[PDB]
Structures are given as structure tokens and as C-alpha cells.
Amino acid sequence: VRYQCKNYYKLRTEGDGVYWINKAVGDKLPECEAVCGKPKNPANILGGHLDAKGSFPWQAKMVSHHNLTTGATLINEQWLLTTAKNLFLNHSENATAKDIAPTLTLYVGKKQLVEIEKVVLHPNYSQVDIGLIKLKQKVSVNERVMPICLPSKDYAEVGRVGYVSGWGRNANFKFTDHLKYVMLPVADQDQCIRHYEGSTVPEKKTPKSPVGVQPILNEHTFCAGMSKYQEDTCYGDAGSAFAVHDLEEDTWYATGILSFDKSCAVAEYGVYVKVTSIQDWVQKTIAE
């Protein structure tokens, strides 16, 4: 017979599935993996755009020990992308990644709690605010849970509008009960450093953030401004993917991971770390 599996999955093999000895590979017995960022009902945080249809299956709700909801992004069936500042919530600056993992609680889909096997931070997580979350077992991919796909290109070119889902605080600074999203356009890079630092030159940079804290701005991060309705991302939206819809192949790509969520509505730009910069590191981490 031919090996085929159910929806939201693609066959991972070399030659077809007809077999128990296969004339192509022998006795491989292939296992089919999930599907890159193809939501069942795709879309089309202070602001609105209520995620009523479950348009962002990759979004995961990460709650720390002291109950500060943050965000995470499913990148494959077993791993998630978040920010190092999200994992280091309620932890010492010298805390390792071994004791961070038991602290966190993760929710995918509606409220589907998923156990965290291990958490690995970016080696340069002071410059690249990224941490990787590994689940104990691969999550069941369905219309509400589905990994986003890591981009093959750089969709962070200025003017591109990506959808930023979020489980963070809203206009009342209350952690949102329902998942929301905004359509934030990526802004000019020079305007963003100039907005936070002084003059995009190291000898003249100053802590000029309209908000108290300073974002991590470097070559690995881009910036997305507020939407046309002056809505942006607030506390707890960090770790949420800057999901970009590629109309050519109808696939959703995590162009960036929201690093600076403290730009609720005061700072005009939210800082997103480029996934393409971290794509090489995460793929090497999936291997081990």
C-alpha cells in the first residue's frame, strides 16, 4: 500500500509511499511532518483585530512563575521561538537555561498546555534577544495549532506589512483575554535607531527612548511602526512572530520575533529581531 497521513501534514520520504519492502528505499517506513505556516483560516497589543477565527496557530502563550503572560512562536512541530528577556522573567541575570525550563508554562491553541522539555538561549542573547523552547513531545498540528515557517528570504524590506499576533497587554494594560493581532509595517531602519539612540553613529548615540528602557538595536533587528490607527504592541507581546504573508506561494513566514514590547504606544517603533539572522542558529539547534 501507499503511506499517506492526514491533513496539515506532508509526507517526509524519498520515493512515493508504495510498499513490507519499498522498491525505492527499502524499509524506511517514513514519518510525515507538519506543514509550514498554512493556517486553516488565515487573517486579513493595544489595537483591535480580534483573532476570532484562530488565524495565528503559531502563537503560543508563555506565562512565567510570577504570572506575566508573554509570547512564543511555533517554528516547527516541537520547538518554539521566544525572546531571551521572556525566558529570564523572574530569574537572575546569572541564571542558566536548565532551571528556566521548569519555571515556564506554555499554552498553544485555545488553552492546550504543553510541557517544556528544555530551553536553549541564543549564545549572544545580549545582542540577539532569542531563546528556543523545546516541547517534551511534538504538538498535534490542527486548525488551532500549527508552526509558522522560517523565511527563505528577507521580508523585512521597508514598507512590508506583517501581522503581529500577541497575548500581551492591551489599552487598559490588562493581559488580553483573547488573542489579538495588528498589521504593523516595517519602518526605515535609520528612523528607528534615530528614534531610540541618538544619530545611528556609535559616538553620538544617546538613550533617547520615549519609553524608559532601551531596545536591542543592531544588524540582527528590524523595526515595525504602529499601524494606521496608532496601535502597537505592548508588554507581553515579546516573542510573537512578525508573521509576513507571502502572496506568491500563500505561506506565512516569521520574518521577525518581537523583542522590544515596551513600545506600547509611546515609542513609535517596535523592535523585531530578524529570524533570517537567527535561522542558521535555530536549525543547528533543531539538529541536537
Binding site: 522573567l89 494594560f173 515596551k262 506600547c264
Partner: peptide
């Protein structure tokens, strides 16, 4: 309202 939101965001920025 925008000014009070700015004040709150400045005061709540370092919250952790």
C-alpha cells in the same frame, strides 16, 4: 489620555 498613557508606560517600562 495619550499623556497619561505615556506617563504610565514610562513608569511601567522597567516592570518585570
Amino acid at each position: 489620555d495619550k499623556f497619561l498613557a505615556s506617563v504610565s508606560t514610562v513608569l511601567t517600562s522597567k516592570y518585570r
